[PDB]
């Protein structure tokens, strides 16, 4: 049944290499290269500390690169960018702690989770899995990507204020750096924003303006990096890449004798992981390829599940981390790569290149060593607010703080609901609250259930409140 998508995309495929020779493409490549590499580094590092180096940076780098290349080539949706995520980290930590508590060879039990993943995928794919996906409404997607964008923005700010804690303002004896980090970030962000507006505002002529504005992000990055460069007397945290790659697993163990019962029972955690990757990647493909964006061509749900989680299983076998399709990263790779609304350029080459690049960052170390984190904090913040764009829920939250004097494209929605819209959006908000407290705990792994629990349940208890004309126009 997946075939529908292969048939959809493979003809477009041999066209998508020619589609890629634009400059906007190149700018996008640089932008997304950093947007993918920074979390690869950071998450890799966390992943190493948690697992005491059994599953480390270079593993995540390799996996991200290879998986990236492969999916880029064979995917139904080459705009999707595959990388590690927070949830996946939470689970790695969990499963490691458990495994080692019970004295299980962590990496092996990992492998078995992988086998189970391969199986589950073959099943759910061959038997119409994505069917369920067609029941994922906007009321879901918006709560989801707004929750994410919000968490993302929040996280970025937390990193900055961490720098402030590591080096507080005081006298003697560390100093002068917190401020400069702040400055660098603020500056980078400001320049990104400015260049964007420049790209869409009157000044300057044609290709010069559109190209300068398309390279908004890389130009910003460059400028601020030069600023840090010429400022030589004050320490700044910079991107750190391992000097060189370091660290097939035998499913019966390496230092064990891996218990047979557990190499059955790894089925449950493989269930949880499968649910995570499924939820994320699927909702993500939904938001990237929604009708509101001009891209309504060459995209499919089935191929991507098989590819992503399959890669995942194999990776698990090679002592690599499995990856899902990221929301924010993919969204911003789409916007990159987007003309204004106007058609979006659909490449296999953008993704291919950010992947390869992520791979070779090892070699790129001397370059990347000059790039101050603060700068990329700025870029992050920019991605955060940019990610906030196409979300109607956001539009409405805003619309609440706005006087009732201003109206939407659709008179129906505000006129029928001058109070009630705020209530509907209010339910959105309270859902957001719930999911934010759930995800707040180390109970957070429960979330992908809660997210469904909340929405398609709400989305049945909602017709209790308003009607098939009323509610219908809200998505």
């Amino acid at each position, epitope marked *: 049944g997946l075939v529908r998508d292969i048939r959809r995309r493979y003809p477009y495929y041999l066209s998508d290499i020619t589609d890629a020779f634009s400059p906007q493409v190149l700018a996008a490549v640089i932008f997304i290269y950093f947007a993918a590499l920074s979390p690869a580094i950071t998450f890799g590092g966390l992943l190493g500390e948690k697992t005491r180096n059994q599953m480390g940076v270079s593993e995540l780098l390799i996996s991200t690169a290879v998986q990236g290349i492969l999916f880029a080539l064979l995917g139904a949706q080459p705009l999707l960018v595959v990388g590690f995520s927070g949830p996946l980290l939470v689970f790695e930590e969990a499963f490691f702690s458990f495994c080692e*508590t*019970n*004295g299980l060879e962590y990496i092996v039990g990992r492998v078995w989770i992988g086998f189970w993943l391969i199986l589950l995928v073959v099943l759910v794919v061959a038997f119409e899995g994505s069917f369920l996906v067609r029941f994922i409404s906007r009321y879901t997607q918006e709560i989801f990507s707004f929750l994410i964008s919000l968490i993302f923005i929040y996280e970025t700010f937390s990193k900055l204020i961490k720098i402030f804690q590591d080096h507080p303002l005081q006298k003697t004896y560390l100093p002068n750096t917190a401020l400069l980090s702040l400055v660098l970030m603020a500056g980078t962000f400001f320049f990104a924003m400015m260049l964007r507006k420049f790209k869409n505002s009157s000044y300057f002529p044609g290709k010069l303006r559109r190209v300068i504005g398309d390279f908004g992000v890389p130009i910003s990055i460059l400028i601020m990096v030069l600023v840090d460069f010429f400022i030589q007397d004050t320490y700044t945290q910079k991107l750190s890449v391992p000097d060189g790659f370091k660290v097939v697993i035998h499913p019966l163990g390496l*230092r064990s*004798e891996f218990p047979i*019962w557990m190499m059955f029972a790894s089925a449950l955690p493989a269930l949880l992981v499968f649910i995570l990757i499924f939820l994320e990647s699927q909702i993500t493909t939904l938001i990237v390829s929604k009708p509101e964006r001009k891209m309504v061509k060459g995209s499919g749900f089935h191929l991507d599940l098989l590819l992503v989680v399959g890669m995942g299983g194999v990776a698990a076998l090679f002592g690599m981390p499995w990856l899902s399709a990221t929301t924010v990263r993919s969204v911003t790779h789409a916007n990159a790569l987007t003309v204004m609304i106007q058609e979006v350029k659909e490449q296999r080459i953008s993704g291919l290149l950010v992947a390869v690049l992520v791979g070779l960052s090892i070699l790129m170390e001397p370059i990347l060593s000059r790039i101050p984190l603060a700068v990329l904090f700025g870029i992050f913040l920019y991605m955060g607010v940019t990610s906030l764009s196409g979300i109607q829920l956001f539009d409405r939250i805003l619309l609440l703080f706005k006087p009732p004097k201003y109206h939407p494209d659709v008179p129906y929605v505000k006129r029928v609901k001058t109070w009630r819209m705020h209530l509907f959006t209010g339910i959105q908000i309270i859902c957001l609250a719930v999911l934010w407290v759930v995800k707040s705990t180390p109970a957070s792994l429960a979330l992908p259930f809660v997210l469904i629990l909340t929405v398609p349940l709400r989305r049945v208890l909602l017709p209790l409140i308003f009607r098939n004309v009323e509610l219908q126009c809200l998505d």
Partner: antibody
Amino acid sequence: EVKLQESGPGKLQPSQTLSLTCSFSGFSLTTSGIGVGWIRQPSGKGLEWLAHIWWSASKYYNTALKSRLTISKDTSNNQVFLKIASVDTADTATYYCARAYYGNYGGYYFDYWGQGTTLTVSS
Amino acid sequence: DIVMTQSPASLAVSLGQRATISCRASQSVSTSSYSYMNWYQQKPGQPPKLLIKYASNLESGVPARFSGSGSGTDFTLNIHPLEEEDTATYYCQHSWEIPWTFGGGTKVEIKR
């Protein structure tokens, strides 16, 4: 009252199979995070870890020695056992049964030690 | 697998003085926040006894004249003020990965 008690054959002919027994009390080998195993000290030397087994029945073995080692457990009678195949005179040592603890910050350290049992391999 | 090198092999130290023992690891054995190094005391004719876990954390009941420190690949045990009963062999071991291994031990003897 956490106790560990080693028992062995005292002495053993070369080429034969050593069977060691550890009996314990004051804790269960059903409890998560706890492992029981063996470390040996050759006469006038330091310490060599042999093997350990957890409630999972997963069992870690010392490389190089792995092949000659088999560890098992009788949880219901608070015992663990170690077998060493084709024993040689280099296996003459004191064999300690020690409890392993899963550290608050991960990892393990040896919590309680039996008084040990002396083994001599000689014709 | 991790190899550990203790030094000195033997140490003779006057009563009430400071005994200091070091244990080098063949690779790092610590995270950003914890170090996984243990210290044991074995008096002659006795089993080893746990003194220190996590490089510097005194195991309950262990005398405060014992103290541990270090990080990365380099670790240090201190006994001050040294007492008569402290004459013993002292062992370090890592808990970074399986197989757990021990250092070769340091015999601390009293000078009289």
